[PDB]
Enzyme design. Structure first.
Site, short mmCIF file in Angstrom:
data_model
loop_
_atom_site.label_atom_id
_atom_site.label_comp_id
_atom_site.label_asym_id
_atom_site.label_seq_id
_atom_site.Cartn_x
_atom_site.Cartn_y
_atom_site.Cartn_z
N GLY A 50 -15.99 -9.60 60.73
CA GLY A 50 -16.52 -10.43 59.66
C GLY A 50 -16.44 -11.90 60.02
N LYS A 70 -7.48 -12.84 61.51
CA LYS A 70 -8.25 -13.97 61.01
C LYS A 70 -7.94 -15.21 61.83
CE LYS A 70 -9.66 -16.02 56.59
NZ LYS A 70 -9.49 -15.99 55.12
N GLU A 125 -16.25 -2.65 54.17
CA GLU A 125 -16.34 -3.36 52.90
C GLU A 125 -17.01 -2.49 51.84
OE1 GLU A 125 -18.64 -6.76 53.86
OE2 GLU A 125 -17.18 -7.58 55.31
N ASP A 164 -11.57 -15.16 44.21
CA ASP A 164 -12.74 -14.79 45.02
C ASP A 164 -13.03 -13.30 45.00
OD1 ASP A 164 -15.03 -15.50 46.50
OD2 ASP A 164 -13.96 -15.61 48.39
N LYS A 166 -15.19 -10.13 44.83
CA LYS A 166 -16.56 -9.73 45.13
C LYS A 166 -16.49 -8.53 46.06
CE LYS A 166 -16.93 -13.42 48.61
NZ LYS A 166 -17.76 -14.59 49.08
N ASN A 169 -15.12 -8.70 49.66
CA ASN A 169 -13.70 -8.95 49.87
C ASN A 169 -12.85 -7.76 49.47
OD1 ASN A 169 -14.39 -11.51 50.71
ND2 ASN A 169 -13.61 -12.56 48.88
N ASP A 182 -8.93 -11.75 51.72
CA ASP A 182 -9.44 -13.10 51.44
C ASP A 182 -8.70 -13.84 50.32
OD1 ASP A 182 -11.88 -11.64 52.74
OD2 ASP A 182 -12.48 -13.75 52.74
N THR A 199 -17.42 -17.93 44.63
CA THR A 199 -18.75 -17.53 45.08
C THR A 199 -19.71 -17.57 43.91
OG1 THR A 199 -17.80 -16.15 46.78
CG2 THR A 199 -20.09 -15.67 46.09
N1 IQU Z 1 -14.39 -11.09 53.47
C1 IQU Z 1 -14.79 -10.00 54.37
C2 IQU Z 1 -13.69 -8.96 54.50
N2 IQU Z 1 -13.71 -8.33 55.81
S1 IQU Z 1 -12.95 -9.03 57.06
O1 IQU Z 1 -13.01 -10.45 56.82
O2 IQU Z 1 -13.51 -8.49 58.25
C3 IQU Z 1 -11.24 -8.60 56.91
C4 IQU Z 1 -10.41 -9.56 56.40
C5 IQU Z 1 -9.06 -9.31 56.25
C6 IQU Z 1 -8.53 -8.10 56.60
C7 IQU Z 1 -9.36 -7.07 57.12
C8 IQU Z 1 -8.87 -5.79 57.47
N3 IQU Z 1 -9.64 -4.80 57.92
C9 IQU Z 1 -10.96 -5.05 58.04
C10 IQU Z 1 -11.54 -6.25 57.77
C11 IQU Z 1 -10.75 -7.31 57.29
#
Ligand code: IQU
Lengths: 348, 13
Positions: A50, A70, A125, A164, A166, A169, A182, A199
């Site tokens: 992401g 992250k 997601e 946030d 949505k 997230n 997030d 958002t």
């Molecule tokens: N806001 C988008 C959420 N997806 S991401 O940022 O890739 C994402 C963010 C934080 C933890 C995650 C754990 N597993 C998969 C994806 C993760």
């Protein structure tokens, strides 16, 4: 009344146990807030999951465990005036503990970046699954919504606002349950706060109108989420943010004809412009939501214990599998030889 | 008509 004797007492005792749970949870949170690592070359970078920061699937070299890392550019964080938000993100994730909140495992920094290493949640997601299927049936949406209600009951009891919500997230774990990610806008707020953030489709009117707002903006956002899960699109829908804002502030919500009257009633009380009337902001608190007719079949304890059969179980192809995520352009992780923004990020 | 792709957060107005 609505409840007979046995029902009324069972529910009252249930609510008192919630108070006791929350009191203990606050003790534990404060202890970790008071007495809270790794480094980049400890991980193999696999794939970007992401972008927005940037989150990468990584593999810990010694153990072979997979994580979601992250990566935040210190200079970008300063320019966008997100220093305090980024410190909030780390500190809050470090201190909370709840079954539907993603767990932070490591955190560290180098000359150019900040890193937050979280548990990898392989189911993808909710956003992807929602857009693929179209809409969720009401029982399916209710299963997810109940987890958000409990998570916000937990966060708000700690005086934490999330800001946030949505589907982007919300990650689906191997058992079909939700992981909230997030926390960049999460903040310790006893009462009012003033930052314009979130958002567009999910912003409460009081944010758009530049009021000093409170934790009830999260309950408005819950109404947006439930609507979007059950409709396939959010209630205030337009191509450009300014048009979205105008619709939010009018507040005139229209519902699909397949929405149950119980659902519409719940949503009219969450998507309530008048804060003296908005569910989650009244004397009865979260119980106005948890005791609403739309949630009458919800066993809140069973949801918390993850004992309810999930409506959807992601296909899990093995450790490190990313098949439930979209592809993104892959960029170098370049680390300057000169430290940047050392003073700004000393507490990180 | 409205936004069907992933939605970015805003940090101001
Ligand atoms: N806001 C988008 C959420 N997806 S991401 O940022 O890739 C994402 C963010 C934080 C933890 C995650 C754990 N597993 C998969 C994806 C993760």
């Amino acid at each position: 009344g609505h409840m007979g004797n046995a029902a009324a007492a069972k529910k009252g005792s249930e609510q008192e146990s919630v108070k006791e749970f929350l009191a203990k949870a606050k003790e534990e949170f404060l202890k970790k807030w008071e007495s809270p690592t790794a480094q980049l070359d400890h991980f193999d970078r696999i794939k970007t999951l992401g972008t927005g920061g940037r989150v990468m699937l990584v593999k810990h070299k010694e153990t072979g465990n997979h994580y979601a890392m992250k990566i935040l550019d210190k200079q970008k964080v300063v320019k966008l005036k997100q220093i305090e938000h980024t410190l909030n993100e780390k500190r809050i994730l470090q201190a909370v503990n709840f079954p539907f909140l993603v767990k932070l495992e490591f955190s560290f920094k180098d000359n150019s970046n900040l890193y937050m290493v979280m548990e990898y949640v392989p189911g993808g997601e909710m956003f992807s699954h929602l857009r693929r299927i179209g809409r969720f049936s009401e029982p399916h949406a209710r299963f997810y919504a109940a987890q958000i209600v409990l998570t916000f009951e937990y966060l708000h009891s700690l005086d934490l606002i999330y800001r946030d919500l949505k589907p982007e997230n919300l990650l689906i774990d191997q058992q079909g349950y939700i992981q909230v990610t997030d926390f960049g806008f999460a903040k310790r707020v006893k009462g009012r706060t003033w930052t314009l953030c979130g958002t567009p489709e999910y912003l409460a009117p009081e944010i758009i109108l530049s009021k000093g707002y409170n934790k009830a903006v999260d309950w408005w956002a819950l109404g947006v989420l439930i609507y979007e899960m059950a409709a396939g699109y959010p209630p205030f829908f337009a191509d450009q943010p300014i048009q979205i804002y105008e619709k939010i502030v009018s507040g005139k919500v229209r519902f699909p004809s397949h929405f149950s009257s119980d659902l519409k009633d719940l949503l009219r009380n969450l998507l309530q412009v008048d804060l003296t009337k908005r569910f989650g902001n009244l004397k009865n608190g979260v119980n106005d939501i948890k005791n609403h007719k739309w949630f009458a079949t919800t066993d809140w304890i069973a949801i918390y214990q993850r004992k309810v059969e999930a409506p959807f179980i992601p296909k899990f192809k093995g450790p490190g599998d990313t098949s439930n995520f979209d592809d993104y352009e892959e960029e170098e992780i370049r680390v300057s030889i000169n430290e940047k923004c050392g003073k700004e990020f000393t507490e990180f | 008509a409205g936004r069907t792709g992933r939605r970015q957060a805003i940090h101001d107005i």
